[PDB]
DNA sequence: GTCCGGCTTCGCCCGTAAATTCAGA
DNA sequence: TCTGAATTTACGGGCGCAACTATGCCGGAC
RNA sequence: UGGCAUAGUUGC
């Protein structure tokens, strides 16, 4: 039918070839009979007959005069479709200036004029004059005239002389402009400026220019002449209750912008007074205005009820418009809608459906039937034999429904877990049974949740259903490798139950001669299901080529254990089931499972391990009690100890030692180290709380108790809530992530006295705010991810690129967090991985690193693996499976057509919603650590230092003077073992190179301040500092010494705004004491509110603390705080005080130091040496006159702007910080995320380049393209003797990279409706809807899935 | 001796709606907020009990 | 009952264009 | 007295999904 | 016989 959309502005000549009939009478229903009228809003004549086939007056009523017009009324008799989408139209008495073109921000009439807006505006509502043919007077072309101005002009300049008004004199500007001579006068003095401003602005109005010469539209068409009209039935009349018409908004509108038409065309008829016209041409343009876009011009018109009208505007855009509100989404028929139960009987397929809702669906399908097997003739007779629900409709039911999947869906679909195909298994009931594995896929609880039930219809969507989203084909999460359907809270209390054992219970001892005699004693009451035990165990292992080789021997394990392994498949080692069994075991089982037999023993096995959890949690009767949360007896000392703490530190407070915040912040550390101990001196007694014995000496055991059987197994709860319970539960954070610093120094078994249930309630409203009102956030960035990365699908199987990332262990600081095995899993890598001993080849180039190959790897200690990356693909249009890697849904390399941008959008979107969601599951408290304040080696090892710049004081102790210190202690095989940040001031007890061993502390600072150490000795001047608005100095006058405090930006007074307070050292004499062979002296800068208590001229030496900043609060270190430094990232915002780097490599040189703003130069060696930067003096530099730069090097320390990050060390380096940057955040939180999909979405950031030289090609000089067009226009010259167009990849944020899209469609769903389309229309955009959106929109075949074939094969067969 | 108030009753705090869930001190202050809110819905059954 | 018409402010964040203020020649 | 860069100010867009119940829906001349 | 507004509520 069609394969482009075409957009382009509406000439008048177009608008009337829509139309097929002006309308002139403002009425659109005469009241009293509901015929149209005779040529209003609501007509026959112009948009069509009322009723299908039927003239109005009754004249002709059949089809035989189907095309013929009646000539009583001149109704064409036809359907009534066709009055859908008849559209008419409105010849306005005056030009009419389109409200889009003139406020679209930029405004395209402003500046194709070059004339400012609120000028234009002026002149539009009839204000000002404005000059068209100025000719010989001593008026410009663009000047504006007032009244007096006219005046003047008409009694002096009563010549030749066109000074117009309204929006006829915008529209004969525009007429009178020659788009090609004033593209020429504009790049031709475009290339003779100097400035950088008139430069962009230049550039737009060239751009937008050619942009009107290029597309087939005129500037004059910005004005409307002829006003389209919708057809009547998309803003139809429908009764409401009584006589009264439902009161439409686009009627309105309409029938108010004809009245001001009539009225004016009338007054312009009889020759009315010019003020009179104008001001009536001036509500014209007002009504007109609010037609098109109610509001945007400003005082939005309201109707009865003061509700501003819905204008076209609002209905094509926003939330609630035809995009986000028919197209994205619809409502379906086939579809109803049930609160959901258990049922655990049911398989992992399968899923409970009422027989009513079964009935309801299923109607035109047994309608089929019942025609087929001849009970019905007719289909009336079918549809009242359903209605009856006769005996004989229930066999057809549950015939029809043997092999017809049903999706199952829950309301937030945050990922593409939350649609699920089961086969339906008819209910006595009213709720659908859903099988309880699921469930954690679904995030569905059973507390009154509804989910829906949608039928496939067609034989391809039935087998769509059956073989993709069946719940036997979704055990592994599509986010990550781990398994989503490991059992929740019951099933993993039952196997924990099961697999356990207790130093004395009935049967212990004995030999056992199999599983099943463990079974048979256990149910005959003679043994235990948790005594030790010696049992005949056969186990298969598969090491040979696929034979399941059995092996027999005699295990030390318990009844339980024994019972348990009946239930695990052939292939699985007996060890597996030999431990504990919690929930993390549990899912480890089934994954192995998986790996290693499949898919169906993977199910069946799960739904063995379900229903054998349920048995046994059944049977072990295992409840909860108010004496199992035995409180601890450690608890009041802990508790009277930090009190003391905080009543000294008080005392220290009020003595002014310290100051409000870093007192709050010592509270706070010292508060949580004591809730801390609480938790540990619970935990201790409640594990070894049973001692037993019945057969000698005591023997400590693990508790039988219920809470804690049930937090150690992962069933439900973690260390906070038992906490909560038992402990102490600590402090609260209120709304807005500030933490009382008040604790709660009762648990939930005690009181909590009206006092401490007014603190909570500050935290419970905190949790229930961020599940209400900051969900808003994490949804609008799933979105953005998703419309960012939409059409981005696997195309090719491999693109041959031989470039990649470097993936290491992270060890941000701590332990290990995501091994080397996580990090590489499941990957294709780059380059051959050679042995760490010596060049030998350890795996091939292109070899998928699947358990297997990761497992090789940690037995032979490799360190860093080069991968292939999606950003380093060299795919056009497309990713190929080898880039991307493994599926992470199966166990396979990614098909080829599966969309990877959806699935990474909903990864790394659906976590943040969830747990955003979820925080008020601990109530309120503060996830609280200790500052840490020292830094404690655990393993032996050597210590290496990076990033370091010390200095050793009078002590000889090592003090770091540099910010990104890394402590990282290495292994004697030259591994690093451990990661550590040294912070800016920190005191380190050994040295660089030297070996420590375990549990030796090796650095310590404060972490409540930030020193400000120096790096030479002398004297201390307070240089360029006044007293009173530089520095707020306090008399200690009963001493005799003084204080003072740097006073930030905001407390400074504004006279004298730039005065900097600073610490200068100086010798004896009166001289800046250099620091050790520089060239400026050494003086450290005072950042605001630092407490300074050294006074003027006072001895100091090296590595001393001249003055220390509070270092503020950080409040509750959550994921409603963490998300927005996700969306910051992906956003690309440029931090507050970026750090500035180097451009280029070679020698270092400061030149003038003009103003305080020095002036940086990189002089490569043989380069461009005459390269400069502007550096403000007032920041710290690195690098000073003496030494080697690589591009890339940190000039001065801060956060780093990712666009410099991509400028300079390239594409690897920018998608290797954002990932890692992200990856802090999502780990905080315990989210695993493949880096597959933040590598994804970084490609879909970086997807535009600007061109840098235009080559032998066709692009601009300075213009921004897609970097796949530019790729292969490059690849292209090459081919030929040509040379490609140089480029410089962009970072866009996901915002800006989606609406900056080839495609308008997809901007147009996405943000910011009105602009995309204004830009769409002017530029003359033709779209080849070839992404997911647009296929999506127009109702064809995704290019994704089944789709991808059909769409490549039209490609194919263009 | 400074005491220049006293609260006249402990359950001046809360509202006719939190004040009717025995041991309410014991209950974490959403899953209170939950169940007043869950009072307000109950149904009236055939008998009172 | 049947027919006809044009007084509310009070949110948080960010991107982008216009206006201002330096900082010079 | 002019002119470019950086800074400030003004102003337009964004602010999750799904579901259920109830009431009210225009004010002024012949 | 389908639309908008306001209020209340459920699941996240
Ligand atoms: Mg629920
Ligand atoms: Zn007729
Ligand atoms: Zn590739």
Redesign the interface.
């Known amino acids: 039918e069609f394969d482009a959309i075409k957009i382009a502005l509406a000439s008048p000549d177009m608008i009337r070839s829509w139309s097929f009939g002006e309308v002139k009478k403002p009425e659109t229903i005469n009241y009293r009979t509901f015929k149209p009228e005779r040529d209003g809003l609501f007509c026959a004549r112009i948009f069509g007959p009322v009723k299908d086939y039927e003239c109005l007056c009754g004249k002709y009523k059949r089809l035989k005069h189907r095309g013929v017009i009646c000539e009583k009324c001149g109704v064409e008799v036809t359907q009534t479709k066709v009055r859908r989408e008849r559209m008419g139209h409105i010849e306005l008495a005056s030009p009419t200036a389109h409200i889009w073109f003139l406020k679209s921000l930029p405004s395209r009439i402003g500046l194709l004029l070059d004339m400012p807006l609120r000028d234009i505006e002026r002149v539009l509502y009839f204000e000002s004059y404005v000059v068209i043919e100025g000719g010989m007077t001593n008026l410009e072309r663009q000047q504006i005239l007032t009244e007096e101005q006219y005046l003047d002009a008409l009694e002096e300049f009563g010549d030749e002389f066109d000074a117009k008004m309204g929006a006829e004199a915008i529209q004969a500007l525009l007429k009178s402009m020659d788009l090609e001579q004033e593209c020429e006068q504009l790049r031709e003095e475009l290339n003779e400026t100097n400035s950088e401003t008139k430069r962009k602005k230049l550039t737009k109005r060239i751009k937008l220019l050619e942009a009107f010469v290029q597309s087939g539209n005129k500037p004059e068409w910005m004005i409307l002449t002829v006003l389209p009209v919708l057809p009547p039935d998309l803003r139809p009349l429908v009764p409401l209750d009584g006589g009264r018409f439902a009161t439409s908004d686009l009627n309105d509108l309409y029938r108010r912008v004809i009245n001001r038409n009539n009225r004016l065309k009338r007054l312009l008829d009889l020759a009315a007074p010019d003020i009179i016209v104008r001001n009536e041409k001036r509500m014209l343009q007002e009504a007109v205005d609010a037609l098109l876009d109610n509001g945007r011009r400003g005082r939005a018109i309201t109707g009865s009820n003061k509700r501003p009208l819905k204008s076209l505007a609002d209905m094509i855009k926003g939330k609630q418009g035809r995009f986000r509100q028919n197209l994205l989404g619809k409502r379906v028929d086939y579809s109803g809608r049930s609160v959901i139960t258990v049922g655990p009987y049911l398989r992992l397929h399968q899923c409970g459906l009422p027989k009513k809702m079964a009935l309801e669906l299923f109607k035109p399908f047994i309608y089929g039937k019942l025609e087929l097997r001849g009970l019905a003739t007719t289909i009336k007779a079918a549809k009242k034999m359903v209605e009856r629900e006769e005996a004989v409709v229930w066999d057809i039911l549950d015939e029809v429904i043997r092999e017809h999947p049903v999706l199952l869906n829950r309301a937030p679909t945050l990922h593409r877990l939350g649609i699920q195909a089961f086969e339906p298994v008819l209910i006595e009931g009213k709720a659908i049974q859903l099988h309880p594995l699921v469930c954690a896929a679904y995030n569905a609880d059973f507390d009154g949740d509804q989910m829906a039930v949608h039928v496939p219809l067609t034989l391809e969507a039935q087998l769509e259903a059956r073989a993709l989203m069946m719940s036997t084909n979704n055990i592994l999460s599509p986010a990550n490798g781990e398994p989503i359907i490991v059992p929740s809270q019951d099933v993993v209390l039952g196997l924990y139950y099961m697999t356990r054992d207790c130093v004395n219970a009935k049967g212990e001892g004995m030999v056992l001669t199999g599983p099943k005699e463990a079974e048979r004693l256990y149910r005959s009451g003679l043994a235990s299901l948790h005594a030790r035990v010696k049992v005949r165990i056969t186990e298969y292992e598969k090491d040979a080529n696929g034979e399941l080789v059995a092996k027999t021997s005699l295990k030390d394990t318990t009844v339980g254990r024994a019972i348990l392994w009946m239930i695990v498949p052939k292939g699985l080692p007996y060890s597996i089931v030999n431990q504990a069994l919690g929930k993390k075991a549990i899912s480890k089982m089934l994954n192995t499972c998986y790996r290693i037999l499949g898919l169906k023993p993977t199910v069946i096995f799960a739904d063995q391990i379900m229903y054998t959890g349920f048995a046994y949690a059944a049977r072990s009767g295992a409840s909860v009690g108010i004496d199992d949360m035995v409180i601890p007896e450690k608890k009041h000392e802990i508790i009277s100890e930090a009190e003391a703490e905080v009543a000294e530190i008080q005392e220290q407070f009020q003595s002014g030692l310290v100051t409000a915040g870093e007192r709050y912040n010592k509270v706070i550390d010292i508060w949580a180290a004591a809730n801390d101990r609480v938790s540990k001196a619970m935990m201790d007694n409640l594990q070894t709380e049973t001692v037993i014995n019945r057969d000698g000496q005591e023997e400590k055991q693990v508790s039988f108790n219920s809470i804690y059987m049930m937090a150690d197994s992962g069933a439900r709860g973690s260390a906070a809530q038992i906490r909560?319970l038992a402990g102490m539960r600590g402090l609260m954070a209120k709304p807005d992530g500030s933490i009382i610093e008040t604790p709660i120094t009762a648990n939930?078994?005690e009181?909590?006295?009206?006092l401490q249930?007014?603190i909570?309630?500050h935290?419970?409203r905190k949790?229930?705010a961020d599940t209400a009102l900051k969900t808003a956030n994490s949804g609008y960035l799933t979105r953005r991810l998703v419309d960012v990365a939409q059409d981005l699908v696997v195309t090719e199987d491999d693109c041959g690129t031989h470039e990649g990332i470097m993936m290491t262990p992270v060890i941000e600081g701590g332990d290990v967090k995501e091994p080397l095995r996580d990090r590489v899993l499941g990957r294709v890598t780059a380059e051959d991985v050679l042995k760490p001993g010596t060049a030998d080849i350890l795996v091939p180039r292109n070899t998928l690193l699947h358990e297997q190959w990761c497992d090789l790897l940690e037995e032979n200690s490799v360190d860093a693996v080069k991968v292939r990356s999606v950003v380093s693909c060299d795919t056009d249009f497309g990713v190929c499976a080898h880039c991307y890697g493994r599926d992470l849904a199966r166990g396979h390399i990614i098909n080829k057509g599966e969309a990877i941008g959806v699935i990474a959008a909903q990864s790394i979107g659906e976590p943040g919603t969830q747990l955003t969601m979820r925080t008020?599951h601990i109530?309120?408290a503060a996830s609280r650590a200790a500052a840490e304040s020292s830094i404690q080696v655990k393993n032996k090892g050597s210590i290496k230092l990076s990033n370091v710049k010390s200095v050793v004081n009078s002590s000889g102790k090592l003090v770091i003077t540099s910010r990104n210190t890394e402590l990282k202690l290495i292994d004697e095989f030259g591994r690093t073992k451990e990661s550590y940040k040294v912070p800016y001031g920190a005191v380190l007890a050994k040295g660089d190179g030297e070996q420590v061993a375990g549990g030796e502390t090796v650095a310590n600072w404060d972490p409540h301040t930030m020193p400000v150490i120096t790096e030479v000795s002398g004297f201390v001047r307070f240089t360029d500092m006044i007293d009173g608005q530089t520095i707020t100095r306090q008399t200690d006058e009963l001493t005799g010494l003084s204080s003072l405090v740097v006073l930030d930006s905001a407390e400074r007074t504004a006279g004298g705004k730039d005065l900097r307070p600073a610490l200068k050292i100086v010798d004896a004499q009166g001289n800046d004491v250099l620091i050790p062979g520089t060239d400026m002296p050494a003086q450290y800068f005072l950042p605001g509110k630092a407490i300074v208590q050294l006074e003027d001229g006072v001895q100091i030496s090296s590595g001393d603390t001249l003055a220390r900043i509070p270092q503020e609060s950080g409040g509750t270190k959550d994921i409603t705080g963490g998300l927005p430094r996700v969306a910051d990232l992906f956003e690309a915002r440029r931090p507050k005080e970026p750090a500035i780097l180097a451009e280029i490599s070679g020698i270092v040189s400061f030149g003038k130091e003009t103003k305080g703003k020095r002036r940086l130069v990189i002089t490569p060696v043989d380069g461009s040496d005459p390269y400069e930067e502007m550096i403000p003096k007032w920041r710290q530099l690195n690098v000073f006159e003496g030494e080697r730069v690589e591009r890339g090097d940190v000039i001065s320390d801060g956060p780093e702007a990712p666009h410099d990050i991509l400028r300079l060390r390239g594409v690897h380096a920018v998608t290797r910080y954002i990932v890692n940057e992200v990856q802090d955040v999502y780990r905080l939180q315990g989210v695993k995320i493949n880096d597959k999909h933040i590598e994804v979405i970084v490609r879909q950031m970086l997807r535009k380049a600007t061109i840098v030289n235009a080559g032998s090609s066709d692009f601009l000089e300075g213009e921004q393209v897609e970097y796949s067009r530019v790729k292969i226009a490059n690849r292209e010259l090459e081919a030929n003797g040509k040379v490609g167009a140089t480029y410089s990849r962009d970072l866009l944020g996901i915002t800006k990279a989606s609406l900056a899209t080839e495609s308008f469609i997809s901007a147009a769903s996405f943000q910011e409706t009105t602009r995309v389309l204004t830009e769409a229309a002017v530029a003359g955009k033709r779209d080849e809807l070839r992404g997911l959106k647009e296929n999506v929109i127009v109702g064809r075949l995704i290019p994704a899935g089944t789709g991808y074939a059909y769409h490549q094969d039209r490609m194919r067969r263009r | 001796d400074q005491v220049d108030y006293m609260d006249v009753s402990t359950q001046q705090v809360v509202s006719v709606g939190a004040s009717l869930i025995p041991f309410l001190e014991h209950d974490d202050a959403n899953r209170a907020l939950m169940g007043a809110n869950m009072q307000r819905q109950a149904v009236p059954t055939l008998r009172a009990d």
């Not at chain 1, 009181?751 to 009206?754: D, E, I, K, S, T």
């Open positions: 909560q939930f078994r009181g909590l006295n009206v249930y007014f909570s309630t935290g419970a949790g229930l008020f109530g309120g």
